[PDB]
Amino acid sequence: FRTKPAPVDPSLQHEIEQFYYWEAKLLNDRRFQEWFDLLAEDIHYFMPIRTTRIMRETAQEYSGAREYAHFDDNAQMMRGRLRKITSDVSWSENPASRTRHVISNVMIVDGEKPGEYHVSSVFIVYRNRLERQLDIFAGERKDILRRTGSEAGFELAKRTILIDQSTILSNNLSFFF
Amino acid sequence: FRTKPAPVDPSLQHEIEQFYYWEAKLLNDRRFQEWFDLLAEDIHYFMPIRTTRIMRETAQEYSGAREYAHFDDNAQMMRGRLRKITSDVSWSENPASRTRHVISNVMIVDGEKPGEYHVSSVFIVYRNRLERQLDIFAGERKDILRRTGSEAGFELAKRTILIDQSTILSNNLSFFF
Amino acid sequence: AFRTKPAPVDPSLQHEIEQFYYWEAKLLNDRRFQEWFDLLAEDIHYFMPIRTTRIMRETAQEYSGAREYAHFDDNAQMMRGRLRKITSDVSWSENPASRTRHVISNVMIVDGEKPGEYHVSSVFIVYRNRLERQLDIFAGERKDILRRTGSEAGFELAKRTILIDQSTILSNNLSFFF
Amino acid sequence: WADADIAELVDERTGRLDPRIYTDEALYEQELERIFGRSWLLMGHETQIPKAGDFMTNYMGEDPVMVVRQKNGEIRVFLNQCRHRGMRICRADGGNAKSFTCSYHGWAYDTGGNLVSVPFEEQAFPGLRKEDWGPLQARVETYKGLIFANWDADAPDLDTYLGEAKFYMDHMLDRTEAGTEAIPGIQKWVIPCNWKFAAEQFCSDMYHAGTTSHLSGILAGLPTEGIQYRATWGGHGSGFYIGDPNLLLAIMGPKVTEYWTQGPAAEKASERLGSTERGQQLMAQHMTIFPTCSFLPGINTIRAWHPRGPNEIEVWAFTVVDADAPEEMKEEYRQQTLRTFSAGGVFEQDDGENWVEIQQVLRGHKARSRPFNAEMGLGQTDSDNPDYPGTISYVYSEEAARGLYTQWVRMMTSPDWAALDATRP
Amino acid sequence: WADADIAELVDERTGRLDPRIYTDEALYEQELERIFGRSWLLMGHETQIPKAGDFMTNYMGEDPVMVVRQKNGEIRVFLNQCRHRGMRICRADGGNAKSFTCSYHGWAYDTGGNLVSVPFEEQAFPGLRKEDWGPLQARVETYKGLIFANWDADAPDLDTYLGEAKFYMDHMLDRTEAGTEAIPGIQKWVIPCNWKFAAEQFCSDMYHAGTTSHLSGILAGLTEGIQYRATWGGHGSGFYIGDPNLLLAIMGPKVTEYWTQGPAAEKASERLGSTERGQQLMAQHMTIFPTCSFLPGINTIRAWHPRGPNEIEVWAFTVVDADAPEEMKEEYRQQTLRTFSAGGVFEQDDGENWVEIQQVLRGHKARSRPFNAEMGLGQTDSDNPDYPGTISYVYSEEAARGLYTQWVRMMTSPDWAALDATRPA
Amino acid sequence: WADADIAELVDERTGRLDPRIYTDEALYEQELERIFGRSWLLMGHETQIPKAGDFMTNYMGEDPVMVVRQKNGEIRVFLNQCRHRGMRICRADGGNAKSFTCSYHGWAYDTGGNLVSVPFEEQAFPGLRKEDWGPLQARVETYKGLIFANWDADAPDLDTYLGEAKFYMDHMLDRTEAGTEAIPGIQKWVIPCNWKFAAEQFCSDMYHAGTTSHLSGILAGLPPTEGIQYRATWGGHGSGFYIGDPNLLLAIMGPKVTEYWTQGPAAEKASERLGSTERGQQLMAQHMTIFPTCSFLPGINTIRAWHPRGPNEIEVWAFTVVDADAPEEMKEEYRQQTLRTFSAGGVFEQDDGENWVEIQQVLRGHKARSRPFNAEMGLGQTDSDNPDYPGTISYVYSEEAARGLYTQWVRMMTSPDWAALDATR
Numbered sequence A, B: 001f002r003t004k005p006a007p008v009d010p011s012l013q014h015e016i017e018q019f020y021y022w023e024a025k026l027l028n029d030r031r032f033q034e035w036f037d038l039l040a041e042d043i044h045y046f047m048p049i050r051t052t053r054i055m056r057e058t059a060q061e062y063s064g065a066r067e068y069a070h071f072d073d074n075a076q077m078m079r080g081r082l083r084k085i086t087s088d089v090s091w092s093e094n095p096a097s098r099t100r101h102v103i104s105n106v107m108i109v110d111g112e113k114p115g116e117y118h119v120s121s122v123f124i125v126y127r128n129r130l131e132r133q134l135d136i137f138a139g140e141r142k143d144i145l146r147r148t149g150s151e152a153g154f155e156l157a158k159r160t161i162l163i164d165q166s167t168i169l170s171n172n173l174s175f176f177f
Numbered sequence C: 001a002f003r004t005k006p007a008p009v010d011p012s013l014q015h016e017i018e019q020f021y022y023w024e025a026k027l028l029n030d031r032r033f034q035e036w037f038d039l040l041a042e043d044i045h046y047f048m049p050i051r052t053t054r055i056m057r058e059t060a061q062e063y064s065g066a067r068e069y070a071h072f073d074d075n076a077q078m079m080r081g082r083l084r085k086i087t088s089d090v091s092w093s094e095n096p097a098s099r100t101r102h103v104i105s106n107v108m109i110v111d112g113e114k115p116g117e118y119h120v121s122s123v124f125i126v127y128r129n130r131l132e133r134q135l136d137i138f139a140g141e142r143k144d145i146l147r148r149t150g151s152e153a154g155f156e157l158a159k160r161t162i163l164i165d166q167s168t169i170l171s172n173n174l175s176f177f178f
Numbered sequence D: 001w002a003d004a005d006i007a008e009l010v011d012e013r014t015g016r017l018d019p020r021i022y023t024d025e026a027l028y029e030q031e032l033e034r035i036f037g038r039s040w041l042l043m044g045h046e047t048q049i050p051k052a053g054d055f056m057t058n059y060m061g062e063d064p065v066m067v068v069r070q071k072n073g074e075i076r077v078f079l080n081q082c083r084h085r086g087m088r089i090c091r092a093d094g095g096n097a098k099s100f101t102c103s104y105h106g107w108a109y110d111t112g113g114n115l116v117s118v119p120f121e122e123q124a125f126p127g128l129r130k131e132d133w134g135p136l137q138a139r140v141e142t143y144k145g146l147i148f149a150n151w152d153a154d155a156p157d158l159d160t161y162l163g164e165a166k167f168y169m170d171h172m173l174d175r176t177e178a179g180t181e182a183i184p185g186i187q188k189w190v191i192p193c194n195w196k197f198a199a200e201q202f203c204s205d206m207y208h209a210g211t212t213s214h215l216s217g218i219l220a221g222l223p224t225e226g227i228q229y230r231a232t233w234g235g236h237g238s239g240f241y242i243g244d245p246n247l248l249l250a251i252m253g254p255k256v257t258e259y260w261t262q263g264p265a266a267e268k269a270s271e272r273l274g275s276t277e278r279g280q281q282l283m284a285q286h287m288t289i290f291p292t293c294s295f296l297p298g299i300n301t302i303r304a305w306h307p308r309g310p311n312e313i314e315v316w317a318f319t320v321v322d323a324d325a326p327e328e329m330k331e332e333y334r335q336q337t338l339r340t341f342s343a344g345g346v347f348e349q350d351d352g353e354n355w356v357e358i359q360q361v362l363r364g365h366k367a368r369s370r371p372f373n374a375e376m377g378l379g380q381t382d383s384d385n386p387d388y389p390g391t392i393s394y395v396y397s398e399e400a401a402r403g404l405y406t407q408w409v410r411m412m413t414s415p416d417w418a419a420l421d422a423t424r425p
Numbered sequence E: 001w002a003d004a005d006i007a008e009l010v011d012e013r014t015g016r017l018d019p020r021i022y023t024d025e026a027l028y029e030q031e032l033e034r035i036f037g038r039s040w041l042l043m044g045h046e047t048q049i050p051k052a053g054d055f056m057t058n059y060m061g062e063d064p065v066m067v068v069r070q071k072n073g074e075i076r077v078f079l080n081q082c083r084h085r086g087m088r089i090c091r092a093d094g095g096n097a098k099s100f101t102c103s104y105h106g107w108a109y110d111t112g113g114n115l116v117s118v119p120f121e122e123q124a125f126p127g128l129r130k131e132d133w134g135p136l137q138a139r140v141e142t143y144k145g146l147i148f149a150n151w152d153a154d155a156p157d158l159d160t161y162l163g164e165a166k167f168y169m170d171h172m173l174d175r176t177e178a179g180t181e182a183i184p185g186i187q188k189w190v191i192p193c194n195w196k197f198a199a200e201q202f203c204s205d206m207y208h209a210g211t212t213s214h215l216s217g218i219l220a221g222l223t224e225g226i227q228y229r230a231t232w233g234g235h236g237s238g239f240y241i242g243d244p245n246l247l248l249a250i251m252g253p254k255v256t257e258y259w260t261q262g263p264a265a266e267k268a269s270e271r272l273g274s275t276e277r278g279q280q281l282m283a284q285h286m287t288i289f290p291t292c293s294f295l296p297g298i299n300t301i302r303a304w305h306p307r308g309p310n311e312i313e314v315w316a317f318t319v320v321d322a323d324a325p326e327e328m329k330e331e332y333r334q335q336t337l338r339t340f341s342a343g344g345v346f347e348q349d350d351g352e353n354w355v356e357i358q359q360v361l362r363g364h365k366a367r368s369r370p371f372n373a374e375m376g377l378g379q380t381d382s383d384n385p386d387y388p389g390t391i392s393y394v395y396s397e398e399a400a401r402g403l404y405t406q407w408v409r410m411m412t413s414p415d416w417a418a419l420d421a422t423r424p425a
Numbered sequence F: 001w002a003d004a005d006i007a008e009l010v011d012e013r014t015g016r017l018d019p020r021i022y023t024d025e026a027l028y029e030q031e032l033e034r035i036f037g038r039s040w041l042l043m044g045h046e047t048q049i050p051k052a053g054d055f056m057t058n059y060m061g062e063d064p065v066m067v068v069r070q071k072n073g074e075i076r077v078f079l080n081q082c083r084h085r086g087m088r089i090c091r092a093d094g095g096n097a098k099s100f101t102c103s104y105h106g107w108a109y110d111t112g113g114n115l116v117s118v119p120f121e122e123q124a125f126p127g128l129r130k131e132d133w134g135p136l137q138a139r140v141e142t143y144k145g146l147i148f149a150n151w152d153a154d155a156p157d158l159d160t161y162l163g164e165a166k167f168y169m170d171h172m173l174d175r176t177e178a179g180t181e182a183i184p185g186i187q188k189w190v191i192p193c194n195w196k197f198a199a200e201q202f203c204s205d206m207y208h209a210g211t212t213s214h215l216s217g218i219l220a221g222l223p224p225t226e227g228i229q230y231r232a233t234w235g236g237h238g239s240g241f242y243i244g245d246p247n248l249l250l251a252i253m254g255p256k257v258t259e260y261w262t263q264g265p266a267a268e269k270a271s272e273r274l275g276s277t278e279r280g281q282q283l284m285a286q287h288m289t290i291f292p293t294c295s296f297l298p299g300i301n302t303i304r305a306w307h308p309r310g311p312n313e314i315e316v317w318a319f320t321v322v323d324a325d326a327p328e329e330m331k332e333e334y335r336q337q338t339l340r341t342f343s344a345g346g347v348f349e350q351d352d353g354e355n356w357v358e359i360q361q362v363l364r365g366h367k368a369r370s371r372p373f374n375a376e377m378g379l380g381q382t383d384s385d386n387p388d389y390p391g392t393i394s395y396v397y398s399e400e401a402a403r404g405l406y407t408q409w410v411r412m413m414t415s416p417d418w419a420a421l422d423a424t425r
């Protein structure tokens, strides 16, 4: 994405858009088993810590590879999170949050391997819970989708959530971007 | 939408999206006479009350058919609401609020009768009034759209607005989702 | 213009203008301001009228007019000055820089009278977060005139009108772009 | 705030109201202690929680509470706080509970709010008496389906607290031997205004309906004689039009209007109430049970107002119907009631808009510096009315409102129920 | 807060400002009484409301006010609050009306703010004297286009209040016999900072312009001067002399030329009896205490509106000479908008600065030591033959110290009599 | 609030806490003065700012500070407030700088926060002693990598303030001669609850871990009974831990970290430096608080400072420390497991965030604040002369440590200076 993506067949745009719209419905409707099934064996689910920097130093704005982060999980760690979030004793999500993943700005670029795709999209995540809690997030998800023989049509191989926050404006991050 | 929707032709996607994008303009620009003209005479405009439930009772998360609701209107009731909102003595909308319906995640499934279409989409509704009032909403709208000979192309036969709020975070609900 | 429902257009035209806006948002959000200002036409008119609370019978005076004060009302020369400022290591409103997110939807396209040109309505949420905890959420409509162009973006922005869903601006400044 | 200072803020003999009763934080602290901490407060309807285990959350001021049906058919209301370290015992709005378990350190409660178990009791809490470490219990009584609760043992019982106001409540609650039931579903929303505006309006303010507020709401559905009750004591009030079905038809439609004034069910209500006027000629009644229970007999919306500081309230509303009404009438009450008196309703939409502007203006120093005009219908009373008990005025009066604010003074200036009881005639 | 404790918060002798003046809630409330409740405040410009019936809202403190042209040409200002139950009389920002009707219970007002009728008055309000029950009225006076209001009957007239600051206002308001007009449109935005930082900056603070704050806004545009500090009242103004350079970077070549050369700049010198005044003053800033501020030359003007101690709104507009060519009215319009606005390339950065000052003052240590206000101490001259008042070099905080001393005097005076007695003979 | 009134709020004799300690605004203002203004508080770790010029921001209460490495290796801490007119001297979270300039009026500082220049000093500021006008400086002192700060010159040194809590800190900080380092990256988030809930949890609350709070978090790491707790003889610090059973540690941090902590050369070396095989190899899931707001979990290796934001809110600033000589695979494993568990999004700390937030909202209620919480667990079951572990030792399930924390709260809150605080020893 360092230069404008080359045009793509609108049939491809529509397909990957549909994949994300369906992803959003699974998350938002608490169908977590199905959402985790979208994840690849080699999933890297990554959400780096963002910091405020003077212009001459915006290179260190995000935490890098061997540094602390909000998320930086592999398939095993994501499998633990799924156990937790479908638990009758998981208090952050029982009672369950009400989330909305508004997905836009989908841009697609061919991958290095075929059947793989680099995707950039933006989001508003709206989390309402209990009586009156309202946390509104926004950002970019830089993905790598890989083609698969399933109904979903793809699996998520890599996700980097660039969050538009320094300090997280939420008492937790108990849901998934 | 119990399972992932069978792919549709991108021209149908585009036709329905443009119908919602034009719908949004009608509402945000206060063209209420034209908006109500979209409602079929069998219109069911429903918005159930949402509650916070433990995981084992999420079946009762939404109010059902013979229960109380934010909206549960037929053509006669909506006509009354049009007659109210186009009057110089309707104080909640004179002065008028400024709204924005940011629609996305449009997924389309073919209806039972031909010419009909099950649609799921998400929204943010941003509503600002007077000097500094700001109410931000999100949710899903599950519609049945029906083919028609008008310039619009469809009529809204049914709509269920699932709002991501328990307690409503607004002094009223004087606009339309 | 968008007085009646836009005539259907080729899905390839929808996709291509959409991708322009998606890329535009990436430039702004990732602070690639040199490239963003390059998208601007030499006859750019960048307009954000002051909006105002009125009774029904006076909604005509909701928006400020052509010879009236405004949030933005800028030509190429004026926007050139804002590009100089925002690329200064002493531009304190954006050093340290804001973190913005333009979420674009409701893109509706109508053929322009002049070939190559297009009138587009689209909506937005601009999410702007900064410093430790500052958060401003904006929404509104963008009425643009786009012009087809041989640059990699593929259009330039000839005209933009930002219709903001606020009367009093709920933000200490407007140091970024819509 | 000294007691003497508080009593000046409201004068019922001249009819002035100092607007700082709506804005001052110290007054509001004192309201929670002296009004909400010892008033009877609407919790719901019995039919909302019919089976044992069935619970619903509610509020008493800003204290969150559980309302739960017991094994034996009693209802307990207790504070939704664990006494260990203050965790909310239940985070769900309602359901059917087998028990409750505190999510922080596992203190377990039964459905009556009793502490029945504590992890590691024998090693870590040897002395502990679990029967003394349950959340505060409130007194719970009922009147014709409505559940009220009150923390204070020194308070009078519901029936006395309601007093002569029973008469006017009965126009909605006592229309049939079957009693009423709640339509399931409770709407909640946030209006940034003081609670005394809402309570007052439903106590005394037919004038707002009879003029400009609801012009547009009446038009969406397409008024001369009437009286206003003002409690001899206690701050309750009700008003209603007599004779003319006009206004009810434009609010609730022709089916409900007919049901309210004509045919078997309406004649039944005239009989049990001993008066053709009460049962069949009453139109668009509003009422408040001091402080924060309000309802509109006929339309049949009822709600509690919950304070959220001086500058905000929550409204928790639902609809009651005659238990024996035909299924098609219950359905009509459901639709018409949500069409009108809810957040999106064509009437109530507009109340939320008005009250919000009043409160925002009172940020201003000068706006809090002169009194409001509470003088409507001063002197034009009659406490000797043969058919209607209490202090009766014309339906356009603020006499009930004067009594609501006088009661507010009496509660706010009484250290306990003994002192308050000493303010009656 | 006793008067003696307030006086110790500011020291004009040493040059110290206790930071708690910008944060303490109790001070803020006293500022609303003692500053905003009796000061002259900017309502706007005659030409924003030219015809009978034209109105615009504004604020005096957090009191919302209507500002209305009458049939006899008079400008009235009244509280936008209905005395019945506090409803905002008019919720529009401005328009033209023949009357104003309250939407709550329909109390009707003529365009001067008089209560002219009340629904059902005869059967429900027999005693009522309507002429006693209208919204509070402010005194309105103008100065060469500018509208000011003031609640207090014992305050000096506007002319006295402005005093010798009129001399400095005339560099913007009296450059021609035609007068100024307001370009239509008022930008309002919210800045989470104390009003005093903004009032002070336009009063005293050329230092920030000639240092680091606006380096970037000057780049977007590619020494000597004096400062005035009123002898009494806390007004201030500073300006550079004889150096076009800077004013060309802010406003560009066409505005700079109109301000310094040609017939219109000759007329200005004639009318101000001095070439220095008319053609040589470059980038003037000024505050009429407490919250009216402007920059002659650039011709932005604004009112700062308090919103507690931690927030303000800025309501800004631009004025042009009414006989200026239409190309010059247009240039002024675009350049002010490009510079001294929420999005403008200068004012952008003032917003960010004030915001961070105020957040930092949440800290306990941050509020525990005085700020330094000793710049230019004792480097004054109050017998200057060309410029009235207490003159300093353009980089000084005399005016600042004068503004905080007028703050002290108003905060420690029970009334205008006590305040008149702090004047010098 | 009077000294005696504050002492009744806490009762370690019968084990009772008044919930107003968590809500009252006046006690909060006093906390900032009497606790945060004179306690030692975590600024971070030495290796986060290893090179000269390296800075990071932090807070001491609601006072923002700069932590900056000097050319001589000194670490300086100074208020992030320019003394001129309050601007925040630096708005980035960290980086490397040769100096800092105020963006408002350009007052310049060296990397130690000494004022080194003032624009136009000669004319504008003739008298100015620049070395008296630099921002307030805190005392800085380290302990085994950790940086701490304290405004008060009269406070004891960091060694003494820690006292015998050094022993329990050492289970994390002194396991090898190379010392620890920080993994780069600090997570910051906002939890609407009082700081004392968090400080207390890490001080004394293994009970919540061994019951319900984290049933789900233990589950997530899948395919305990002996332990003691330390209360400080004085000063409010506490730590608890399990002995013997590596089951719980396994399900939190996984097998690699469990192995590193309990078997092999690195654990064997820890046992050697601490003079006990128990201390080095048999300690499971230690929690610790250095009063008031420094908390960490030796073994898990997460450390954090809680920052107050009024009584109803905190920020948590969290980061991970590793042994500096540990294999790069173990540094990596500590990184993943720690952000998986003890972070905003982690499978453990997720649930603490939800519990705390609900505790605080419930305390908006009046009855909710009118009865004491139960702090009676483990009363009397102590031992102040344990041969192996210094301090007052209890079973691992106990609120003895918590009582000590709140008793130290009482002491600091009721002592005008450190002399009177030393008088309670």
Ligand SMILES: c1ccc(-c2ccccc2)cc1
Binding pocket: D201, D202, D203, D204, D205, D206, D209, D214, D251, D284, D285, D286, D296, D347
């Ligand atoms: C309080 C609340 C509502 C009404 C009311 C509104 C419209 C029609 C009839 C009664 C009167 C007092």
Ligand SMILES: c1ccc(-c2ccccc2)cc1
Binding pocket: E201, E202, E203, E205, E206, E209, E214, E250, E283, E285, E346
């Ligand atoms: C107060 C406010 C603004 C200015 C000013 C800023 C930049 C350029 C010219 C003047 C001077 C004092």
Ligand SMILES: c1ccc(-c2ccccc2)cc1
Binding pocket: F201, F202, F203, F204, F205, F206, F209, F214, F252, F285, F286, F287, F297, F348
């Ligand atoms: C304070 C903080 C965390 C824990 C803790 C939580 C889970 C597992 C082990 C210890 C105990 C006290």
Ligand code: FES
Binding pocket: D082, D083, D084, D085, D086, D087, D102, D103, D104, D105, D106, D107
């Ligand atoms: S807070 Fe309920 S058991 Fe501890």
Ligand code: FES
Binding pocket: E082, E083, E084, E085, E086, E087, E102, E103, E104, E105, E106, E107
């Ligand atoms: S508040 Fe204006 S008429 Fe009642």
Ligand code: FES
Binding pocket: F082, F083, F084, F085, F086, F087, F102, F103, F104, F105, F106, F107
């Ligand atoms: S605040 Fe004036 S120089 Fe720093």
Ligand SMILES: [Fe+2]
Binding pocket: D208, D209, D213, D214, D347, D348, D351
């Ligand atoms: Fe009403």
Ligand SMILES: [Fe+2]
Binding pocket: E208, E213, E214, E346, E347, E350
């Ligand atoms: Fe400035």
Ligand SMILES: [Fe+2]
Binding pocket: F208, F209, F213, F214, F348, F349, F352
């Ligand atoms: Fe925990």
